[PDB]
Symmetry: D2
Subunit: 114 residues, 4 copies
């Protein structure tokens, strides 16, 4: 039910081998590790979770943009990019978190479908 | 070699049934019709052209954003969204033109791969 | 009543010396030259037109992004970024057309205010 | 040395009365409250800090986008937009953090200048 896709606005390419960490907000308001991985050659990260595990709640997707840029020899502004949202069972069932990266900027959108 | 993908930033969805026209710049600097279609349920428009037909040159992709917004009952700013670029055989072979739409704004990127 | 602002997403800076050409659709459906200029050190382009001259119509703001990037020695994707909109059709408004540029991407937004 | 500007991509207007909370990472690795405020009628938030107080560090600018959209009666996707960056590590700079908001999307950029 959750996919992350990352694109590079400088090279016009997927953002490959980018580390992505997902956290779930705990009762005590701390961020608990939930899922992680690295984007593929297509810039996508599949298989993070299952429907059974992905219950309603607040999640944070942290994209390691700083390492990505440094590995390309580029000095970036941000420490990481964070996307924080609530999963809601009354809306559609599949979430795509998409990010478009530049050294000093990023854009993100949600594509939520059934 | 050419795919167009359109997303909706208001609803968090693909932008479905959006008209897209592609033009090729002619010798006399006019825009000649090249390919067209409507985005699918996934927001994508496949099959516009073939490798044989898609020669180097300047192309314009015009996305009919005004009709899209009006069909959803929303008053938009732009007449359309235009993406104008040169196809170059020395770069990678497949072009994805991606657009992310809002009533008063849009973002576009190119994903160019082999 | 028309201002253009351009930022650079690679540099984290205003986009300086960006050429901008504005056209207005004529009665015969062609794009007539309306005004032009370049962004300043702040990334802003002021003084394009006047409230008398900026009548109702369909306008095209062409931001010369390729020329900008090439002048910086970079080979970008797009030829230009075009922003096409109907203006002043409910009376005079003030328009800011804002753009944010990367070599293979851009975003644009409008800020429309009623004086 | 720190300014936040927020625009609304649905309205084509400044995003007014947007709450913004700034944190700075402490020695113990927690996020310490640093400053806060709200955007004005222009969409800008000035006066958050001073050059004395805005020392080197890792800062988090939290823009309360959900609260903004809910106050407008809209159910948005994100909880907030967070912008996290190292500041002043090569001496004092001026930072503008700019954001452009839609219910299911946002973009952010930085303008960094050397006074
Ligand atoms: C935040 C953002 C994402 C995207 C985006 O990720 N598009 C996109 C989404 C999926 Br799913 C795809 O498979 C592809 Br290809 C592009 C495009 C733009 C112009 C943008 O500003
Ligand atoms: C993240 C973003 C910011 C902006 C933006 O905020 N531009 C801007 C910055 C400052 Br300081 C201004 O005074 C004004 Br007007 C616009 C524009 C776009 C198209 C965009 O994607």
């Amino acid at each position: 039910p959750l996919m992350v896709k990352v694109l590079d606005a400088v090279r016009g390419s997927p953002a490959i081998n980018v580390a992505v960490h997902v956290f779930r907000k705990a009762a005590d308001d701390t961020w608990e590790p939930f899922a992680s991985g690295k984007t593929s050659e297509s810039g996508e990260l599949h298989g993070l979770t299952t429907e059974e595990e992905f219950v309603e709640g607040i999640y944070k997707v942290e994209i390691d943009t700083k390492s990505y840029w440094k590995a390309l020899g580029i000095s970036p502004f941000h420490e990481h990019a964070e996307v924080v949202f609530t999963a809601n069972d009354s809306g559609p069932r599949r979430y795509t978190i998409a990010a478009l990266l530049s050294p000093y900027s990023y854009s993100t959108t949600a594509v939520v479908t059934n």
